[PDB]
Write a protein that binds this ligand. Structure first.
Ligand SMILES: [Ca+2]
Ligand SMILES: [Ca+2]
Ligand SMILES: [Mg+2]
Length: 815
C-alpha cells in the first residue's frame, strides 16, 4: 500500500510532454492499473503500490512521438521501497505525513507520558523526531532521563541520545518507626559578626551549615524542625528591653559609654525575627524557616542600638528548646537539640533566694533546691525567677560583661579604681540629678564607678553560698529541667576559649555539661568545618544509605535503530561518553578525575555493548543526592525503515537502582525517529516519429506490378505555399525507378505537404511525362488526406484497395 513510481517524458531538445499513457501490472496476480501523464506537472504518477514485482509499459506515447520498445521491471519491497530494475533514475524528495503519536506508556506502573516534536528535526513543515515530555522522570531513588539532545545529520537520520540518572541520600534512624523532632539553637551574639575574629565569617558559615543540616533532617518528610536564634534574648521579632551601664557608689545608674548619654541606661526595640518557633515538616514552612536563618550578626560597635541586644543568654535559649519539645514534640519521636554557639553565658536568670529575716542560710536554701531536682544535681525552673511584671531586664543577671559575677563592686582602670570624669560644664547638672559627684563647678570632678547590682555575685554579702558566674546557674538549670528528659543534645562551639571572664578548660567543662554527654560537645576552630561537625553528630543518630547502589542501566537499541560504532564497526570509547557532575569521566575506558582524582562517581562504572542483543549496559552506579551521571551516544535510523513510520530509539530502557534488588526496575521514557522514503522518477527521452507511405505502380487492367516507372516526391516549400520542390539537395526520392515489385517506398518523412509526380511511364504504357499523381500530408508523423491530383485525361490514376495505395498505368492498346 506504499510503493510509488513517477514517469516523465521529454522531446523537442528537452521540453516536457503531455498525454502519455502507462500501465502497471502485477506479475503474480495479473491485475492492472493504468495512469496518464498529468497536465500541469507533466508527470505520470503511480501511488499506493503493494509489495511485489511489476511490469511497466507505455500503452500510448504522446502525439508526434515514437512508441517505446522498452518494458520496465518495478519491484516494491515489503517496506514500500520502490526500485525500477537496471535503470538510471532521479530519487525525488517526498513530503512527510502529518501523523504523530501523542503519548508513550511507562511499562513499570502503566502511566501515559506526552511526546513532543524535537527542534532541529523540522523538514518542510513536518518533524522527523519526538522526545518525551518531560524527558526527566522523578522516581523514588532520584531522577532519570532520556532524550534526543541533538540532531547530528537530519537528512541522514543521525541523532545524539542522552540518558541521565541522579540519586538520593536516605538517612534512617536506628529505629524506623521513630521519626525525629529537632530544635536548632543558634547563637547570633555580636562576636558572630562575619568580619570579626580576623574575618572568620562566623555568622555566615554557621547559617549556611544550619540551612544544610535542615535539608538533611527534613529530607525524610516525617522529621520535624524548629529554629531558635538567640543573643541577649530570643530573636523572634517581639519588642524587648535590655539594661546597660554602671552605677555610682549609692547605686544610681549611669551609662559610661561614649556612644550614649549618661542617662541612657536601657534600650528598647523589636529584635530581628530569626526564629521559627514551631516544629514543622511542611515544605513551604521549611523554606520560610531556612530564610529566617541569619547569615549576619551586628557588625558595628556599641554606637548601634542593636549591639545592645547581642550578649549570650544561653539559659533562655535552652529554655525555649525545652518548651518547644515539651509542648510540640510527638510522643513517639526521638527529640534532639543541635546548639551552635561561639561563647559561654554572660547572662542568666537568678535563683530565687529568700531574703526574709528568719530565712535559712543561703547554702541550706540552695541544698533544698538541689534536693527537688530529679538527679539531686540541679535546680527546677520554678526555683529561678524568670518573669517579672516590671520586665525581664529588671530581674535578669548579667548584661554581656563577663561569665563572672563580680565579688568586688569596684570598676578598675589602669590598675586603680575608675571614675567617670565630669567636666566643669556638667558638674551642676550631674550633681542635681543626684550622682555622687566629687569636685566643684570650677574644676569639674568625677564619679567613682561600681558595677551595677545585677552584674555582681548574689547574695553579695552572703557568708555561705554565693553565685559567682553565669555557668553554674545555667548548668544547674540544665541538670534540673533538660537532662531528665532523655533528649539528644549536641553542642558545636565556634572558637570557644572562655572570653569574656573565664578560661578554655572551664568553658569546655561548661559546654559539655549542657550537652547530653561530654562527647556531644565539640569545639570547632576552623569555621569552614561547622557543617562537618553537625553532620558527624547527625550521623550518630542516623545511618546514611544511597538509593543507587551498584545500579545498572539497560538500554537495548529499538528495531531498525543502529548504534553508531563509527568506521571500525566496534564499540569503543570513541562511540560514547560517560561523565558525572563531580567532574569525573570515562577516558579511554578508564575512570579518571573527580575532586579526589580517583575516578569519583565513575570509579566502578563500565559501559558495555552486547552485539547480539544490540544493547548498551551501564554497570556500577553509586549515587546519592546531587550525584548525577550522563551517558551520550549516537544512533541512526536503519536503511530498511518504513516511510513515515515512527520508530522508538530504544527497546525497554531500565534502571535497576540496586543489583541487590533485581525486581526493582524503573523505566526511562523513549524518543522516536522517522524518515520518508524517496521515490524513483524515470525520465524518458522520446523520438519524434516520422512518416512513411508506400505505393505500388501497376497495370490499370490486371493490377500487376510494373518495373521501370520513374517518380519524384516533392515537398511544399516552408515559406511559399504554391511551390513544391525537391526534399533536400542530395538526391532524395528524386527519379526513383520501380523494380519488379512495382514499389515506391517513402520513409523518414518530415511533417508537411507532399506531391508525388510520375516522371515517366514504363515501356509499354501510355506516356505520362512529369505529371502530378498523388497529394498527401504528414502530420505528427502520420499520413493524412491522401488524394489524387492526376490532371483530367492523363492515363495515370490513384486507387486505395485492400489497405494498399496503388498507382495505375494504362497499357498502350492494340494499334
Ligand atoms: Ca524539661
Ligand atoms: Ca568505534
Ligand atoms: Mg558570642
Amino acid at each position: 500500500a506504499i510503493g510509488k513510481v513517477v514517469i516523465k517524458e521529454t522531446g523537442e531538445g528537452g521540453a516536457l510532454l503531455g498525454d502519455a499513457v502507462f500501465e502497471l501490472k502485477n506479475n503474480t496476480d495479473g491485475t492492472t492499473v493504468s495512469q496518464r501523464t498529468e497536465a500541469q506537472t507533466g508527470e505520470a504518477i503511480f501511488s499506493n503500490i503493494k509489495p511485489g514485482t511489476y511490469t511497466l509499459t507505455e500503452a500510448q506515447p504522446p502525439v508526434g512521438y515514437k512508441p517505446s520498445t522498452k518494458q520496465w521491471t518495478v519491484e516494491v519491497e515489503k517496506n514500500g521501497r520502490t526500485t525500477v530494475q537496471g535503470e538510471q533514475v532521479e530519487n525525488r524528495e517526498e513530503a512527510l505525513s502529518d501523523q504523530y503519536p501523542q503519548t508513550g506508556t511507562y511499562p513499570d506502573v502503566q502511566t501515559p507520558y506526552q511526546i513532543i516534536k524535537v527542534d532541529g528535526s523540522e523538514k518542510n513543515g513536518q518533524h522527523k523526531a519526538l522526545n518525551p515530555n518531560p524527558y526527566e522522570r522523578v522516581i523514588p531513588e532520584g531522577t532519570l532521563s532520556k532524550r534526543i539532545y541533538q540532531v547530528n545529520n537530519l537528512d541522514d537520520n543521525q541523532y545524539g541520545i542522552e540518558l541521565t540518572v541522579s540519586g538520593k541520600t536516605v538517612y534512617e534512624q536506628k529505629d524506623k518507626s521513630v521519626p525525629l523532632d529537632v530544635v536548632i539553637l543558634l547563637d547570633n551574639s555580636n562576636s558572630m559578626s562575619n568580619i570579626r575574629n580576623k574575618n572568620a565569617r562566623r555568622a555566615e558559615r554557621a547559617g549556611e551549615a544550619t540551612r544544610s543540616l535542615i535539608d538533611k533532617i527534613t529530607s525524610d518528610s516525617e522529621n520535624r524542625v524548629a529554629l531558635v536564634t538567640y543573643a541577649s534574648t530570643i530573636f523572634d521579632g517581639t519588642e524587648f528591653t535590655v539594661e546597660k551601664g554602671v552605677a555610682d557608689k549609692n547605686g544610681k545608674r549611669l551609662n559610661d559609654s561614649l556612644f550614649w548619654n549618661y542617662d541612657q541606661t536601657s534600650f528598647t526595640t523589636n529584635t530581628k525575627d530569626y526564629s521559627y518557633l514551631k516544629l514543622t515538616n511542611d515544605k513551604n514552612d521549611i523554606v520560610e524557616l531556612k530564610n529566617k536563618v541569619p547569615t549576619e550578626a551586628e557588625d558595628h560597635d556599641g554606637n548601634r542600638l542593636m549591639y545592645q541586644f547581642g550578649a549570650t543568654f544561653t539559659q533562655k535559649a535552652l529554655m525555649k528548646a525545652d518548651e518547644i519539645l515539651t509542648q510540640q514534640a510527638r510522643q513517639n519521636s526521638q527529640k534532639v537539640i543541635f546548639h551552635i554557639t561561639d561563647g559561654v553565658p554572660t547572662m542568666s536568670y537568678p535563683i530565687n533566694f529568700n531574703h526574709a529575716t528568719f530565712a535559712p542560710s543561703y547554702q541550706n536554701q540552695l541544698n533544698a533546691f538541689f534536693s527537688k531536682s530529679p538527679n539531686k544535681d540541679g535546680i527546677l525552673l520554678s526555683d529561678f525567677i524568670t518573669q517579672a511584671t516590671s520586665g525581664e531586664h529588671t530581674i535578669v543577671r548579667g548584661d554581656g560583661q563577663s561569665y563572672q559575677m563580680f565579688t568586688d563592686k569596684t570598676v578598675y582602670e589602669k590598675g586603680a579604681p575608675a571614675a567617670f570624669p565630669v567636666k566643669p560644664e556638667k558638674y551642676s547638672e550631674m550633681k542635681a540629678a543626684g550622682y555622687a559627684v566629687i569636685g566643684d563647678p570650677i574644676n569639674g570632678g568625677y564619679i567613682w564607678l561600681n558595677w551595677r547590682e545585677s552584674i555582681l555575685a548574689y547574695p553579695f554579702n552572703s557568708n555561705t553560698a554565693k553565685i559567682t558566674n553565669h555557668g553554674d546557674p545555667t548548668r544547674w538549670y540544665y541538670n534540673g529541667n533538660i537532662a531528665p528528659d532523655g533528649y539528644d543534645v549536641f553542642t558545636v562551639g565556634i572558637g570557644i576559649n572562655g572570653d569574656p571572664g573565664t578560661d578554655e578548660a572551664t568553658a569546655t567543662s561548661f559546654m559539655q555539661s549542657i550537652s547530653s554527654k561530654p562527647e556531644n560537645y565539640t569545639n570547632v576552630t576552623d569555621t569552614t568545618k561547622i557543617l562537618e561537625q553537625l553532620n558527624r553528630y547527625f550521623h550518630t543518630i542516623v545511618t546514611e544509605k544511597k538509593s543507587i547502589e551498584n545500579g545498572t542501566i539497560t538500554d537495548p537499541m529499538g528495531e531498525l535503530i543502529d548504534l553508531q560504532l563509527g568506521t571500525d564497526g566496534r564499540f569503543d570509547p570513541a562511540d560514547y561518553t560517560l561523565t558525572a557532575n563531580d567532574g569525573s569521566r570515562l577516558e579511554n575506558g578508564q575512570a579518571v578525575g573527580g575532586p579526589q582524582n580517583d575516578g569519583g562517581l565513575l570509579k566502578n562504572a563500565k559501559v558495555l555493548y552486547d552485539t547480539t542483543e544490540k544493547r548498551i549496559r551501564v554497570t556500577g552506579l553509586y549515587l546519592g543526592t546531587d550525584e548525577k551521571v550522563t551517558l551520550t551516544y549516537n544512533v541512526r535510523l536503519n536503511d530498511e525503515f518504513v516511510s513515515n513510520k515512527f520508530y522508538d530509539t530504544n527497546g525497554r530502557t531500565t534502571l535497576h537502582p540496586k543489583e541487590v534488588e533485581q525486581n526493582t526496575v524503573r523505566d526511562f521514557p523513549i524518543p522516536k525517529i522517522r524518515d520518508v522514503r524517496k521515490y524513483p522518477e524515470i525520465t524518458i527521452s522520446k523520438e519524434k516519429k516520422l512518416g512513411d507511405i508506400e505505393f505500388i505502380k501497376v497495370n490499370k487492367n490486371d493490377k500487376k506490378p510494373l518495373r521501370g516507372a520513374v517518380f519524384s516526391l516533392q515537398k511544399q516549400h516552408p515559406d511559399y505555399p504554391d511551390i513544391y520542390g525537391a526534399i533536400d539537395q542530395n538526391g532524395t526520392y528524386q527519379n526513383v525507378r520501380t523494380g519488379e515489385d512495382g514499389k515506391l517506398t517513402f520513409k523518414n518523412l518530415s511533417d508537411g505537404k507532399y506531391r508525388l509526380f510520375e516522371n515517366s511511364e514504363p515501356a509499354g504504357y501510355k506516356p505520362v511525362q512529369n505529371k502530378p499523381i498523388v497529394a498527401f500530408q504528414i502530420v505528427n508523423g502520420e499520413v493524412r488526406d491522401v488524394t489524387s491530383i492526376v490532371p483530367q485525361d492523363i492515363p495515370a490514376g490513384y486507387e486505395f484497395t485492400n489497405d494498399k495505395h496503388y498507382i495505375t498505368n494504362e497499357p498502350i492498346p492494340p494499334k
